[PDB]
C-alpha cells in the first residue's frame, strides 16, 4: 500500500539501501549493543556507576543509527512495510527507543532501562532460517492449547478448592502462638506451620519467641488470597518445594489427607505434563509418518588399494599375524592406565603415594604407543599421517612422552584425557555414536536460540531482581544477578527448575515484600522456565526427529493332582487368604500377634509353587529351564528361600507376598509392554555405558582438581582445615547481640571428590538434578588444599558444572526418546416425546438458550467464589451466603425444569444430569448445614459447591472428548501400578525395621518421620519426586539414637543406632527410574498409540464429527423413504460443513 | 437393563439394609459412648441422613417394582437416585459422626462400639452407594 512516496533521492538512497553493506553493519553495531549491555549489567546497585557511564552517551549512538535506517524504513513500503513479522517488530523496538531516550531528555524512569534490554532480538530479526526456527515453534504451541488450559484448569479447579479447605487453613497459616522452647504441640488446637530452618523460633515476641509463619518469612504462598493461592499452586506443580507446604500445613491440623489433595495434584500434573510429552511426540509422529557416502568410502579405500633396512618395516605395515595378538596385550596396557588415571589420583590430601613408580609404567605405555605410530610412519610415511586420527593418537603419545613440566597440573590431568585412546575398541558402537553426534549438527541452531533466549532473559533479570539486587540480612543470598555471570549460572539454575524457588523469593523480598506491585515480578518466573522449560521441550522434537532419522535408517496320580483345576481353586483360595494375612501383616505391629498361621499359609503356598516347578522339571525342562525364564524364577524361588538367616541377611516373611505374583504373569497385557523394556534395555545399553563412561571422565576430572578442596570449616574464618580448633560465634539474625558458642569445624562437605567411587556418589547427585547448585558453590569456594573462601573466589571453576549437566542434556533426553521409537515400531507391531402443558415447557428448555443463561451462572459463581479474601472482617461473608444461596436455589431450580421433561430418563439418560442431581442435594445440604450454624465436615461439603465449576467442563466440548480418551486409555495401564504400589510395598517394609527407629528430629525426619508405615510410602514417594532425597540419605548414613523411646540397645546410644544402607535409596532411585519409563510407554500405548493417531484425525478427517452427524441422526426415526426426505434437510446442510 | 445388574447389586443390597440397620441401632443405642448445641445440631444431621436413607430405599423398592413393569433407564433412574440419596445420607453421617466425636473432645469419659459401628455402616455405604452409582453407567 505505501505511503506519500516520493521520487528523487529517495529512489537513490533505497538503491544504495538495496546493496549489501548495510546490513552487516547494522548487525555489527547491534552485536556492539548486546555487548555494551552485558558489560552494562555490571554493575548497579542503584546509582555509583563506573565505565557504563560513557556507554550512556553510546545508546543513543545506537539510537541515532537505528533512526537513520528508520529514514530508509521511511523510503521502504510504509503500510506494506508493517506486514512484515521481523520488520513489524523492528519498528516496535524503535518506536520503544524513541519513546524511551525521548523521555529521557525530558528527566534533565528505570522502566525505560528495562525497556532497554528488548534490544538483542534484532540479532535473531538480521538472521535468516531463525525465522524458519521461530516459525516451526509457533506451530508447535497450537496442538496442545486444550491441555495447556487443563492445567490451568486445575490450576484453577484445585485454586478454589485450595480457596477453601486451604483457605480454611488461611485462617490457620497466618497465624500462630507459642512459647519456651520450640516444642509446642503441632496439629492440635493452637498450632501452626514452622519456617524452615536448622533450629527455628521466630522471635516476635509473643512470649518466649512466636511460632507460625509463612505468607512472607516463607515467602508468599499462603492461601489467603485467590491470587497466592494460584502461586502456591504453581510451585507445587513444579514438583519443586511443594513438601514443605504439605508438611506445612500438615503441621498445622492436620494428617487427615492432606495427602489426598496433594497426591491427586502432584499425580495429575505428572499425569498431564506425560500428556505434553505425548503431545510432542505426536507432533514427531506426525511429521515423520509421511517422512518416512559408499561411493567416497570406495574412493578412499581403493586408492589405499593401489597405494599398496626400512624396507622390512614396509613388510611390517602388513604383517603380522601376532599384530592380532598384540591388541590382546594392548587390552593390558590400557588397564594398567584404567587403574593408574585412579592409582595417580587415588587417594587425596596427599594421603598415600599410590603412583610410587606408576609414572614409570606410564612412561612405558607412552613407549609402546610411541613404538606403534612410529611403526605406522614407517608403514606408510605421509600417507600414515593422512589420517588426522593416526597424527592425533600419536600426539597423544608423545605427549605423554613429554615431561613433568610445567607448573600447569592440569597438563598432568590431561593424562586422564590420555585414557580416552582405550575407547577405540567397542566395534559398531563408536558408528552408533557418530549417528548421535550427526544429531547435534542439527539442533545446534535452535540451542543457539536457546542460548539467545539464555541471553536476554538473562540481562534483563540483571537489571530487575539484580537490578536491585540488595538485600540486608542476612547470607547466603546465593546467586542474585549481582554480576553477569552470576545471572548466567542462576538464569540457568532456574531453567533446571531446581530450588528456583528460593531465587523467587529474594526476587519478591526484593520489591519490600508483597503489596500490588512487587508481587507483579512473580510473572517473570511464570514467563520464564514455563516458556523457557517449554523451550527445553520443544528440544525433545528436535532429536525425537534427528533419533527417528536413525530408527528411518504312581507319580502320574501326582501329576493329576498339581494339574488339577480344582487344586488351582484351593490355590486361589489360599491365595485370597494369603493375600488377606500379608496385607494383615503390612502393618509393622503384626507380627506382634499371631503372624505363624500366615507363615503356613506361605509356606503353603510356596510347597504348591516348589511341586509347580517339580512338575515342570520333569517334563523336558532342566536345560530348557535354564532357558527359561520361568522354570528358572521358580528354581531360583526354591533356592533363594532356602538361604539360611545366619550369615549374609535375609528374612523370609518377606518373601510371602512373592508367592502370588506369579498369577501376575497370567495377564498378558504386561507381557507385551514388558518385552518391550527387555527389547528396549538391549537397543540402548551403549549409551548406557556412555554415560557411565563419562561418569569416569569427569570423575576423573574432578578428582584431580578438586581433591584438596571442600575440607571446609566454619566460617571462611578459619580456612585452614588444621588451623581449625575450638568453639566459633553464631550471631543470630544479624545483631551484634545475640551470640551463641558452637564448637564448630571442620566440615567433610557430604561429598567429597577424595575418591572416585565418591566422585561416582556425588557426580550422581547433581544427575539427578537435585541439590547440585550448593556443591556448585562450594566448589566455587575451592582454593589449593585446606581452604574455602570467598564470596565469588575462582569464578572459572563454575564452568565444569555445567559443562556436565550440559551432557546429561542429551544422552538422558536420548534415552527416553529410545523407548518411545520402539514404542512406535511396537505401534507398528500393535498395527500388525412430550405431551400437555410439558410439551411446552420442554420445548422452551430444550431449545437450550438457558444453556449460555446457565453457563454466564456458573462464571459468575465463579466470580464468587473468587471473593474469598480473609483478611478481616465480616460482611461480605453474609453476602457470600446469600450469593450461595441464590445460586444453589437457581440452579436446584432448573434441576426442576429438567425433572419437569423425560423424568424417567431426565433422571438419567444422560450421565451428566445425574452428576448435576448430586450437586444439587449436597448443595442443599452444606445449605441447611449454614442454617444450623446458628460443622468442620461442612468443608468437605462445601467442596461440593466447589465441584460446580465441572460443570464448565461438562460444556466443554471437543476438550472433554479428550478426557475420554485419557479414560478409554486409562484401564489398560493400571495393571503396571499395581507393581507400582508393590515396588514400594516391599522396599518401604523392607526399610520400615531397617530404616526404622531412626529418631525424630529436625533433619532432612520430623513431620517426615520413617516411622509407621504410611510415612514411610511418603519417604519413599518424596523419593519418587526428585525431591532433597540426597539430604536424606544422609541422614541416614549413621542417624540417630533409636527413635529415643523405643528398646533402643542398651546403654549404647550416641546416634550410633543406624548405619550405612546408601544402597537402598541409590537402588531405589534407579528402580523408581526403570517402573517409571514403564508407566511411561504403558501410558504411550494405551494412549497416544492410538489418542497420537486421534490427534491426527481430529485435526483433518471428521471422525468426531461424525458422532455429532450421529447426534443429528438423533432427531428422527428408522425409515423408510419418507425419513430420508424429512432427513434430507439435515443431510444437504450437513455435507456442505 | 442387565441380568448381572440385578444379580450385582443383590450383593450390594446386602451390605446396604445392613449398614442401614447398623446405623437404626447407632441412632438407637443408649451405649453411645461410656460416661464414667452441637450434638444436637449433628442429630439433625443424622436425622436429615436418615430421611434421605428412607427416601432412597423407596426409590429402591420403587425401582424394583419399575423394572419390573417397566422399561430399565426409569427404573434404573431410580435406583441411581437411591444410591445418591443413600450416599448423600451416609456422609451427613460421617458428618455427625465427626462432630459427636469432636463434641466429645469439647468434654471421664470413653468411646464407645456403637460409634465404631456407625462409622463402618457409613463406611459400607460410601462404598456401596459408590458402587451402585458406578453400577448406573457402565
Ligand atoms: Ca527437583
Redesign the interface.
Same mark, same amino acid.
Given at each position: 500500500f505505501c505511503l506519500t512516496l516520493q521520487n528523487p533521492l529517495r529512489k537513490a538512497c533505497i538503491s544504495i539501501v538495496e546493496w549489501k553493506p548495510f546490513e552487516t553493519i547494522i548487525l555489527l553495531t547491534i552485536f556492539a549493543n548486546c555487548v555494551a549491555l552485558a558489560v552494562y549489567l555490571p554493575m548497579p546497585e542503584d546509582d555509583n556507576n563506573s565505565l557504563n557511564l560513557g556507554l550512556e552517551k553510546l545508546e543513543y549512538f545506537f539510537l541515532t543509527v537505528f533512526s537513520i535506517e528508520a529514514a530508509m524504513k521511511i523510503i521502504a513500503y510504509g503500510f506494506l512495510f508493517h506486514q512484515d513479522a521481523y520488520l513489524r517488530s523492528g519498528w516496535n523496538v524503535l518506536d520503544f527507543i524513541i519513546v524511551f531516550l525521548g523521555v529521557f531528555t525530558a528527566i534533565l524512569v528505570k522502566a525505560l532501562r528495562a525497556f532497554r534490554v528488548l534490544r538483542p532480538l534484532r540479532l535473531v530479526s538480521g538472521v535468516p532460517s531463525l525465522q524458519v526456527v521461530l516459525n516451526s515453534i509457533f506451530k508447535a504451541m497450537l496442538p496442545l492449547f486444550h491441555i495447556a488450559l487443563l492445567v490451568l484448569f486445575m490450576v484453577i479447579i484445585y485454586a478454589i478448592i485450595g480457596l477453601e479447605l486451604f483457605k480454611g487453613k488461611m485462617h490457620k497459616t497466618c497465624y500462630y502462638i507459642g512459647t519456651d522452647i520450640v516444642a509446642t504441640v503441632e496439629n492440635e488446637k493452637p498450632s501452626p506451620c514452622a519456617r524452615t530452618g536448622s533450629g527455628r523460633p521466630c522471635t516476635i515476641n509473643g512470649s518466649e519467641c512466636r511460632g507460625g509463619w509463612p505468607g512472607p518469612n516463607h515467602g508468599i504462598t499462603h492461601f489467603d488470597n485467590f491470587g497466592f493461592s494460584m502461586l502456591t499452586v504453581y510451585q507445587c506443580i513444579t514438583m519443586e518445594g511443594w513438601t514443605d507446604v504439605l508438611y506445612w500445613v500438615n503441621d498445622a491440623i492436620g494428617n487427615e489427607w492432606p495427602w489426598i489433595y496433594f497426591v491427586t495434584l502432584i499425580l495429575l500434573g505428572s499425569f498431564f505434563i506425560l500428556n505434553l510429552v505425548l503431545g510432542v511426540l505426536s507432533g514427531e509422529f506426525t511429521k515423520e509418518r509421511e517422512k518416512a557416502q559408499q561411493l567416497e568410502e570406495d574412493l578412499r579405500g581403493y586408492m589405499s588399494w593401489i597405494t599398496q633396512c626400512h624396507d622390512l618395516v614396509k613388510s611390517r605395515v602388513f604383517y603380522w599375524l601376532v599384530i592380532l595378538i598384540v591388541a590382546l596385550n594392548t587390552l593390558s596396557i590400557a588397564s594398567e592406565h584404567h587403574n593408574q588415571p585412579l592409582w595417580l589420583t587415588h587417594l587425596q590430601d596427599i594421603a598415600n603415594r599410590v603412583l610410587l613408580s606408576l609414572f614409570t609404567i606410564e612412561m612405558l605405555l607412552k613407549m609402546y604407543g610411541l613404538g606403534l605410530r612410529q611403526y605406522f610412519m614407517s608403514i606408510f610415511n605421509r600417507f600414515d599421517c593422512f589420517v588426522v586420527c593416526s597424527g592425533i593418537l600419536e600426539l597423544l603419545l608423545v605427549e605423554s612422552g613429554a615431561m613433568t613440566p610445567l607448573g600447569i597440573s592440569v597438563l598432568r590431568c590431561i593424562r586422564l584425557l590420555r585414557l580416552f585412546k582405550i575407547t577405540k575398541y567397542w566395534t559398531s558402537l563408536s558408528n552408533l555414536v557418530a549417528s548421535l553426534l550427526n544429531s547435534i549438527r542439527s539442533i545446534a541452531s535452535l540451542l543457539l536460540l536457546l542460548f539467545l533466549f539464555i541471553i536476554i532473559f538473562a540481562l534483563l533479570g540483571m537489571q530487575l531482581f539484580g537490578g536491585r539486587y540488595d538485600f540486608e540480612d542476612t547470607e547466603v543470598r546465593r546467586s542474585n544477578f549481582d554480576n553477569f555471570p552470576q545471572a548466567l549460572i542462576s538464569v540457568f539454575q532456574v531453567l533446571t527448575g531446581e530450588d528456583w524457588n528460593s531465587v523467587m523469593y529474594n526476587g519478591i523480598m526484593a520489591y519490600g515484600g508483597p503489596s500490588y506491585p512487587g508481587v507483579l515480578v512473580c510473572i517473570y518466573f511464570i514467563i520464564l522456565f514455563v516458556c523457557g522449560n517449554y523451550i527445553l521441550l520443544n528440544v525433545f522434537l528436535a532429536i525425537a526427529v534427528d533419533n527417528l532419522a536413525e530408527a528411518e535408517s504312581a507319580t502320574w496320580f501326582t501329576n493329576f493332582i498339581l494339574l488339577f483345576i480344582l487344586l488351582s481353586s484351593a490355590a486361589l483360595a489360599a491365595e485370597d487368604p494369603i493375600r488377606a494375612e500379608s496385607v494383615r501383616n503390612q502393618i509393622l505391629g503384626y507380627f506382634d500377634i499371631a503372624f505363624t498361621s500366615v507363615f503356613t499359609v506361605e509356606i503353603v503356598l510356596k510347597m504348591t509353587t516348589y511341586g509347580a516347578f517339580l512338575h515342570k522339571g520333569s517334563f523336558c525342562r532342566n536345560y530348557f529351564n535354564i532357558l527359561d525364564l520361568l522354570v528358572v524364577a521358580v528354581s531360583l524361588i526354591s533356592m533363594g528361600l532356602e538361604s539360611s538367616t545366619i550369615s549374609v541377611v535375609k528374612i523370609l516373611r518377606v518373601l510371602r507376598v512373592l508367592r502370588p505374583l506369579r498369577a501376575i504373569n497370567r495377564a498378558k497385557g504386561l507381557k507385551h509392554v514388558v518385552q518391550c523394556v527387555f527389547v528396549a534395555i538391549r537397543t540402548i545399553g551403549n549409551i548406557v555405558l556412555v554415560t557411565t563412561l563419562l561418569q569416569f571422565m569427569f570423575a576423573c576430572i574432578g578428582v584431580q582438581l578438586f581433591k584438596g578442596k571442600f575440607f571446609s570449616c566454619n566460617d571462611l574464618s578459619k580456612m585452614t582445615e588444621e588451623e581449625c580448633r575450638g568453639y566459633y560465634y553464631v550471631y543470630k539474625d544479624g545483631d551484634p547481640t545475640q551470640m551463641e558458642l558452637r564448637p564448630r569445624q571442620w566440615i567433610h562437605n557430604d561429598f567429597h571428590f577424595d575418591n572416585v567411587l565418591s566422585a561416582m556418589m556425588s557426580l550422581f547427585t547433581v544427575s539427578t538434578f537435585e541439590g547440585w547448585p550448593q556443591l556448585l558453590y562450594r566448589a566455587i569456594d575451592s582454593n589449593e588444599e585446606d581452604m574455602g573462601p570467598v564470596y565469588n573466589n575462582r569464578v572459572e571453576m563454575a564452568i565444569f558444572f555445567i559443562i556436565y549437566i550440559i551432557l546429561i542434556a542429551f544422552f538422558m533426553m536420548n534415552i527416553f526418546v529410545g523407548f518411545v521409537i520402539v514404542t512406535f515400531q511396537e505401534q507398528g507391531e500393535t498395527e500388525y416425546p412430550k405431551n400437555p402443558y410439558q410439551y411446552q415447557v420442554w420445548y422452551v428448555v430444550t431449545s437450550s438458550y438457558f444453556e449460555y443463561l446457565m453457563f454466564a451462572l456458573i462464571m459468575l459463581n465463579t466470580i464468587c467464589l473468587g471473593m474469598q479474601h480473609y483478611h478481616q472482617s465480616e460482611e461480605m461473608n453474609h453476602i457470600s451466603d446469600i450469593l450461595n444461596v441464590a445460586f444453589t436455589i437457581i440452579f436446584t431450580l432448573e434441576m426442576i425444569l429438567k425433572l419437569l421433561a423425560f423424568?424417567? *430418563?431426565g433422571? #438419567?439418560?444422560d450421565?451428566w444430569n445425574?452428576f448435576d #442431581? @448430586?450437586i444439587v &442435594?449436597?448443595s442443599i &445440604?452444606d445449605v &441447611? @448445614?449454614s442454617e &444450623?450454624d446458628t *460443622?468442620?465436615?461442612?468443608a #468437605? #461439603?462445601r467442596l461440593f459447591r466447589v465441584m460446580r465449576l465441572i460443570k464448565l467442563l461438562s460444556r466443554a466440548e471437543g476438550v472433554r472428548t479428550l478426557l475420554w480418551t485419557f479414560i478409554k486409555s486409562f484401564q489398560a495401564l493400571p495393571y503396571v501400578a499395581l507393581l507400582i504400589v508393590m515396588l514400594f510395598f516391599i522396599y518401604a517394609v523392607i526399610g520400615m525395621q531397617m530404616f526404622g527407629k531412626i529418631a525424630l528430629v529436625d533433619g532432612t525426619n520430623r513431620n517426615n518421620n520413617f516411622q509407621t508405615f504410611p510415612q514411610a510410602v511418603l519417604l519413599l514417594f518424596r523419593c519418587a519426586t526428585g525431591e532433597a532425597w540426597q539430604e536424606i540419605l544422609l541422614a541416614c548414613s549413621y542417624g540417630k539414637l533409636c527413635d529415643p523411646e523405643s528398646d533402643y540397645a542398651p546403654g549404647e546410644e550416641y546416634t550410633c543406632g543406624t548405619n550405612f544402607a546408601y544402597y537402598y535409596f541409590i537402588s531405589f532411585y534407579m528402580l523408581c527410574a526403570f517402573l517409571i519409563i514403564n508407566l511411561f510407554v504403558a501410558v504411550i500405548m494405551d494412549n497416544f498409540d492410538y489418542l497420537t493417531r486421534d490427534w491426527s484425525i481430529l485435526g483433518x478427517x471428521x471422525x468426531x464429527x461424525x458422532x455429532x452427524x450421529x447426534x443429528x441422526x438423533x432427531x428422527x426415526x428408522x425409515x423408510x423413504x419418507x425419513x430420508x426426505x424429512x432427513x434430507x434437510x439435515x443431510x444437504x446442510x450437513x455435507x456442505x460443513x | 437393563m442387565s441380568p448381572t445388574e440385578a444379580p450385582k447389586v443383590r450383593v450390594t443390597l446386602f451390605c446396604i439394609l445392613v449398614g442401614i440397620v447398623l446405623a437404626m441401632t447407632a441412632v438407637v443405642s443408649d451405649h453411645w459412648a461410656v460416661l464414667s448445641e452441637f450434638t444436637t445440631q449433628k442429630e439433625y444431621s443424622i436425622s436429615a441422613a436418615a430421611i434421605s436413607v428412607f427416601s432412597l430405599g423407596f426409590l429402591i423398592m420403587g425401582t424394583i417394582c419399575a423394572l419390573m413393569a417397566f422399561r430399565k433407564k426409569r427404573d434404573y433412574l431410580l435406583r441411581p437416585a437411591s444410591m445418591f440419596y443413600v450416599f448423600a445420607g451416609l456422609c451427613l453421617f460421617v458428618s455427625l459422626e465427626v462432630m459427636r466425636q469432636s463434641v466429645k473432645r469439647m468434654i471421664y469419659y470413653y468411646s464407645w462400639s456403637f460409634a465404631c459401628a456407625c462409622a463402618a455402616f457409613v463406611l459400607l455405604f460410601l462404598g456401596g452407594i459408590s458402587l451402585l452409582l458406578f453400577s448406573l453407567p457402565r
Open positions: 423424568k424417567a *430418563r433422571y #438419567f439418560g450421565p445425574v #442431581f @448430586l &442435594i449436597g &445440604i &441447611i @448445614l &444450623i *460443622r468442620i465436615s461442612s #468437605f #461439603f | -
